[PDB]
Amino acid sequence: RTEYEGYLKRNRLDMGQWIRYAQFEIEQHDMRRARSIFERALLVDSSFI
RNA sequence: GUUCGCGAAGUAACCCUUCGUGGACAUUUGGUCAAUUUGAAACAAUACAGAGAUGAUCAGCAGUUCCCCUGCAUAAGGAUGAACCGUUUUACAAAGAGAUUU
Numbered sequence: 001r002t003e004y005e006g007y008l009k010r011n012r013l014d015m016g017q018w019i020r021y022a023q024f025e026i027e028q029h030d031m032r033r034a035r036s037i038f039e040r041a042l043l044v045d046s047s048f049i
Numbered sequence: 050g051u052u053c054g055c056g057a058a059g060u061a062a063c064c065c066u067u068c069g070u071g072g073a074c075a076u077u078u079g080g081u082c083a084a085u086u087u088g089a090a091a092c093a094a095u096a097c098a099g100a101g102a103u104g105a106u107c108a109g110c111a112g113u114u115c116c117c118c119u120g121c122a123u124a125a126g127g128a129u130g131a132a133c134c135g136u137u138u139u140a141c142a143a144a145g146a147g148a149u150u151u
């Protein structure tokens with residue numbers, strides 16, 4: 001989490017990294033965290049289908 | 050305490066003196082805070098190592114950041130102040146062929 005948050009802090013526009021971080025939380029079975037990551041990504045770019 | 054008024058005692062009687070009594074004057078400070086270990090300062094010390102773009106030695110200026118420090122500062126300086134360097138899979142479809150199955 002520290003790694004992913006560091007990268008997203010330095011470059012919030014990396015939508016691929018946002019998705020990979022959300023998937024990492026999915027693999028931890030922590031859907032609340034995954035949902036939060038997806039929501040934050042939608043806050044950055046809601047147009048990315 | 051003072052002062053205005055009244056009772057009284059002392060004095061021959063006033064002034065004056067004392068005991069009693071009513072009124073007037075003056076009227077609510079300070080704390081976000083307790084005095085060493087357990088509600089938060091840091092440097093330093095010991096060790097190792099010895100600065101980005103390079104084959105080598107270096108000037109830099111920036112940008113991004115939920116890192117700031119020094120400075121009066123919107124100046125300048127702090128290794129180009131530092132961190133930056135990793136990890137990376139699906140709007141996934143169309144046409145066709147040869148093998149698999151009833």
Ligand SMILES: [K+]
Pocket residue numbers: 099
């Ligand atoms: K050196």
Ligand SMILES: [K+]
Pocket residue numbers: 129
């Ligand atoms: K330099």
Ligand SMILES: [K+]
Pocket residue numbers: 129
């Ligand atoms: K500089």
